């Protein structure tokens, strides 16, 4: 059952679409340097533009919503080397172009930015970003009252020497959602994919790598480990394979659970369920595949949308 | 050189246009619930839109700028029973619709609002408003640092009762600009026009009335009394007459009527003063603007008619 598609309202290509916490809102960002937010009308089950606005001087590539317990906040990353934060002002008409106020700007990056992800709420307003400079940066809104008070918490050189050629480069972030697991996050930078963990010293250290990728990692996402003791992160590589890694900490162990080339071409998007019960993958073949785990913990394709 | 008209950019009728302190900026408010601010480009002596934005849920009728010594602040009154204050954020692109941030909202009024006027700077950020509820209200930004800290300073029942069919009502405000004169302001409410003065008890009391109006007072403004000791306030009535009252305080107030002029033959909608209170303007149905200067005898004479 397909539903009535709709126009985003963007002129240039759209890079990311993201859901709010409740799944009733979506934020869109494209190259036309705009961020659009759609609302899912209760009555007429249709998606309808809540507000659109110009937000960056260059192409906006990444986007993300903060936990509802900190307000209505969106974050954006652009090729203009910045990350901007916005907060919805309910006292403005929708579509007015002025429904979301910039709360701040992060200019520390000296290279374009490809990704930005808020951290799990149980760690406060925190976030990460990664760009050409090959330097992952974490920021913290130390005082949850001042949603402008964004301090820089950490800086790590993912690539020792960022190659810097033919912008044939890719980077991705994904925090470990787990509430009852030590703070950590995954990062992909080209062929490599590495995991960081908070130490007793309050600093990030590299705790492992997800080996096997023979090309560019287009996407990666940590799955919600509700119920499980272990962690699972999936990656969609350019070599045309979905990979699912089981990470156990007894400090971290790394198993490869599955590999799937069903896409025959690059896997662009890899996404998870809210319960981490279903995993999605999309690619060149112009198809989306949904995967469930077997009783043996292998992964099986439960359906193919096209 | 180049005094050509220009479009405001409003869809519905425009109610008020106001100049900033320096005369280089203008704020416009219309029924389309927008407030536009124009800039007078130094180089090309043209007026060009600085920023426009939706500010009220209903028709915006009045507007006004605060003294430059408190920042870039505008105040607006609407039929939506509110008065909003805005402060310009120089760190925003012009025309972005995001150049003026709401600093506060005053909801105390239970009837639509027709007028709002900032008080003379020598009294702090203070302001007044009047609406259907027939209750004039003064607000004070007690701490000039917190341009959100707007407290309510006073409430006075102008029209004993606020009756109204809401089909023929008008209200106007105008503070006495004078720096070396006791705080006071004029208020028009329909046929009546009354003056309030601050007492020793820090409360407003009615110190006089400007008698003679035989219809609705569309406009009134106190003139800058630079050089003079007496005060002069003019009113443009619907009965088609401009009136200029000389008010002297010998503190109790005297009231003389200096001039009456029907040259307009129809209602006088706008009555305005000079920065020195040297020239008085009037506009009306006849589609003409008249400028008036005072004679040596203190009568007023029409020194020109624009059409």
Residue B123 DSSP SS3: helix
Question: What sign results for the dihedral spanned by CA atoms B113, B118, B123, B124?
Answer: positive
- 3-state percent helix, strand, coil for chain B, nearest multiple of 5: 0, 50, 50
Residue B46 DSSP SS3: coil
Contacts of A93 in chain B (CB under 8 A): 54
Give the count of beta carbons closer than 10 Å to the beta carbon of residue A17: 15
Question: What sign results for the dihedral spanned by CA atoms B101, B104, B107, B108?
Answer: negative
Beta-strand relationship, B14-19 and B171-175: unpaired
Distance CA A2, CA A188 (A): 33
Distance CA A162, CA A122 (A): 32
Would you give the DSSP letter of residue B139? E
C-alpha dist (Å) from residue B99 to A87, A149, A183 = 17, 22, 40
Give the largest Cα separation in chain A, rounded: 54
Interface test with B, best of A84, A95, A96 (most B CBs within 10 A): A96
Q: Which architecture, in CATH terms, is B1-249+254-307?
A: 7 Propeller (2.130)
Contacts of B102 in chain A (CB under 8 A): 91
- Do the Cβ atoms of A33 and A59 come closer than 8 Å? yes
Question: What sign results for the dihedral spanned by CA atoms B22, B23, B24, B27?
Answer: positive
- Do the Cβ atoms of A53 and A100 come closer than 8 Å? yes
Chain B: give the shortest CA distance to residue A48, in Å. 21
Q: What is the 3-state secondary structure (H, E, C) of chain B?
A: CCCCCCCCCCCCCEEEEEECCCCCEEEEEECCCEEEEEEECCCCCCEEEEEEEECCCCCEEEEEECCCECECEEEEEECCCCEEEEEECCCCCCCCCCCEEEEEEECCCCCCEEEEEECCHHHCCEEEEEECCCEEEEEECCCCCCCCCCEEEEEEECCCCCCCCCCCCCEEEEECCCCCCCCEEEEEECCEEEEEEECCCCCEEEEEECCCCCCCEEEEEECCCCCCCCEEEEEEECCCCEEEEEEEECCCEEEEEEEEECCCCCCEEEEEECCCCCCEEEEECCCCEEEEEECCCCCEEEEEEEC
Distance CA A50, CA A25 (A): 9
Distance CA B282, CA A175 (A): 69
Would you give the DSSP letter of residue B132? T
Give the count of beta carbons closer than 10 Å to the beta carbon of residue B119: 23
* Interface contact A97-B97, CB threshold 8 A: yes
Chain B: give the shortest CA distance to residue A117, in Å. 27
Q: Which of A141, A109, A248, A113 is nearest to A184 (CA)?
A: A248
Contacts of B54 in chain A (CB under 8 A): 93, 96
* Interface contact B98-A98, CB threshold 8 A: yes
Specify the residue for token string 């003065």: B197
Helix and strand numbers, DSSP H then E, in chain B: 0, 24
Interface test with A, best of B57, B84, B92, B98 (most A CBs within 10 A): B98
Distance CA B23, CA B3 (A): 15
Distance CA A273, CA A257 (A): 18
Chain A: give the shortest CA distance to residue B97, in Å. 7
Specify the residue for token string 């970003």: A129
C-alpha dist (Å) from residue A187 to A131, A228, B49 = 11, 22, 47
* Interface contact B98-A93, CB threshold 8 A: no
Interface test with A, best of B35, B97, B104 (most A CBs within 10 A): B97
* Interface contact B54-A101, CB threshold 8 A: no
Q: What is the 3-state secondary structure (H, E, C) of A43-83?
A: CCCCEEEEEEEECCCCCEEEEEECCCECECEEEEEECCCCE
C-alpha dist (Å) from residue A51 to A25, A27, A175, B64 = 11, 10, 28, 30
Chain-centroid distance of CA B23 in Å reads 16
For the record, the structure tokens of B63 come out as: 């507007």
For the record, the structure tokens of A68 come out as: 């509802």
Q: Which of B176, B214, B179, B178 is nearest to B193 (CA)?
A: B214
Q: Which of A223, A226, A222, A192 is nearest to A208 (CA)?
A: A192
Distance CA A178, CA A226 (A): 7
Give the largest Cα separation in chain B, rounded: 53
* Interface contact A98-B102, CB threshold 8 A: no
Residue B121: what are its φ and ψ, rounded to 5°? -45, -40
**How far is the first Cα of chain A from the last one, in angstroms, to the nearest whole number?**
11
- Do the Cβ atoms of A300 and A288 come closer than 8 Å? no
Burial letters for A52-67: b for 16+ Cβ neighbours within 10 Å, e otherwise?
A: bbebbeebbbbbbbbb
Give the count of beta carbons closer than 10 Å to the beta carbon of residue B6: 10
* Interface contact B54-A96, CB threshold 8 A: yes
* Interface contact B97-A96, CB threshold 8 A: yes
Distance CA A37, CA A73 (A): 12
Tell me the residues of B at the A interface, defined by beta carbons under 8 Å apart.
Answer: 53-54, 96-98, 102
Contacts of B93 in chain A (CB under 8 A): none
**CATH among 1.10.10.10, 3.50.50.60, 2.60.40.3950, 2.130.10.10 for A1-249+253-306:** 2.130.10.10
Contacts of A96 in chain B (CB under 8 A): 54, 97
Q: Which of A7, A64, A8, A67 is nearest to A34 (CA)?
A: A8
Q: Which of B187, B209, B216, B184 is nearest to B197 (CA)?
A: B184
Give the count of beta carbons closer than 10 Å to the beta carbon of residue A195: 23
Chain A: give the shortest CA distance to residue B86, in Å. 14
Interface test with B, best of A97, A99, A104, A105 (most B CBs within 10 A): A97
Chain B: give the shortest CA distance to residue A89, in Å. 11
The domains of chain B are located at 1-249+254-307
Kindly report each contact of residues A248-251 with a partner whose C-beta sits within 8 Å and lies 24 or more positions away, as own/partner: A249/A181, A249/A182, A251/A197, A251/A207
Chain-centroid distance of CA A68 in Å reads 17
Distance CA B196, CA B187 (A): 8
For the record, the structure tokens of A20 come out as: 């709010």
For the record, the structure tokens of A257 come out as: 């659970």
* Interface contact B54-A93, CB threshold 8 A: yes
C-alpha dist (Å) from residue B101 to A43, A305, B84, B247 = 33, 47, 10, 40
- Do the Cβ atoms of A263 and A287 come closer than 8 Å? yes
Q: How many CB pairs under 8 A join A and B?
A: 10
* Interface contact A98-B97, CB threshold 8 A: yes
Please provide the DSSP assignment of chain A as one string. ----------SSPEEEEEE-SSSSEEEEEETTSEEEEEEE-SSS--EEEEEEEE--SS-EEEEEEPPTBTBSEEEEEETTS-EEEEEE-TTS-TTSS-SEEEEEEE---SS-EEEEEEPPGGG-SEEEEEETT-EEEEEE-SSTT-TT--EEEEEEESSSS---STT---EEEEE---SSS--EEEEEETTEEEEEEE-TTS-EEEEEE-----S-EEEEEEPP-SS-SSEEEEEEETTS-EEEEEEEE--EEEEEEEEE-TTSS-EEEEEE-SSS--EEEEETTS-EEEEEE-TTS-EEEEEEE-
Contacts of A97 in chain B (CB under 8 A): 97
Specify the residue for token string 């000296």: A110
- Do the Cβ atoms of B10 and B28 come closer than 8 Å? yes
Q: Which of B5, B121, B14, B23 is nearest to B70 (CA)?
A: B121
Cα torsion at A255, A260, A265, A267 (round to 10°)? Answer: -60
Would you give the DSSP letter of residue B260? E
For the record, the structure tokens of B232 come out as: 């002069």
Q: Which of A95, A104, A122, A119 is nearest to A37 (CA)?
A: A95
Beta-strand relationship, B268-273 and B280-284: antiparallel
Question: What sign results for the dihedral spanned by CA atoms A198, A201, A203, A208?
Answer: negative
Contacts of A91 in chain B (CB under 8 A): 102
Distance CA B148, CA B126 (A): 12
Q: Which of B74, B58, B62, B84 is nearest to B25 (CA)?
A: B74
Tell me the residues of A at the B interface, defined by beta carbons under 8 Å apart.
Answer: 91, 93, 96-98, 101
Distance CA A43, CA A38 (A): 15
Contacts of B53 in chain A (CB under 8 A): 98
Contacts of A90 in chain B (CB under 8 A): none
For the record, the structure tokens of B70 come out as: 């408190």
- Do the Cβ atoms of B141 and B147 come closer than 8 Å? yes
């Amino acid at each position: 059952p397909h539903m009535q598609p709709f126009d985003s309202g963007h002129d240039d290509l759209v890079h990311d679409v993201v859901y709010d916490f409740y799944g009733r809102h979506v934020a869109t960002c494209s190259s036309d340097q705009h961020i659009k937010v759609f609302k899912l009308d209760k009555d007429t089950s249709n998606w309808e533009l809540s507000d659109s606005w110009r937000a960056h001087d260059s192409s906006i590539v990444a986007i993300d919503w903060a936990s509802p317990e900190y307000g209505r906040i969106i974050a954006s990353a652009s090729y203009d080397k910045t990350v901007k934060l916005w907060e919805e002002d309910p006292d403005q008409e929708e579509c007015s172009g002025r429904r979301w106020n910039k709360l701040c700007t992060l200019n520390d990056s000296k290279g374009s930015l490809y990704s930005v992800k808020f951290a799990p709420a149980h760690l406060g307003l925190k976030l990460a970003c990664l760009g050409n400079d090959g330097i992952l940066r974490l920021y913290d809104a130390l005082e949850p009252s001042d949603l402008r008070s964004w301090t820089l918490t950490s800086e790590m050189k993912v690539l020792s020497i960022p190659p810097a050629n033919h912008l044939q480069s890719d980077f991705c972030l994904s925090w470990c959602p787990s509430r009852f697991s030590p703070e950590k996050l995954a990062v992909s930078a080209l062929e490599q994919a590495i995991i960081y963990q908070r130490g007793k010293d309050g600093k990030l250290h590299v705790a492992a790598k997800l080996p096997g990728h023979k090309s560019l990692i287009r996407s990666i996402s940590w799955a919600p480990s509700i119920g499980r003791w272990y962690q699972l992160i999936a990656t969609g590589c350019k070599d045309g394979r979905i990979r699912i890694f089981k990470i156990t900490e007894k400090n971290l162990q790394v198993e490869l659970l599955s590999e799937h080339d069903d896409h025959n071409g690059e896997v662009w998007s890899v996404s998870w369920n809210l319960t981490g019960t279903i995993l999605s993958s999309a690619g060149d073949d112009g198809k989306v595949r949904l995967w469930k785990a077997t009783y043996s913990n292998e992964f099986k394709c439960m359906s193919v949308i096209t």
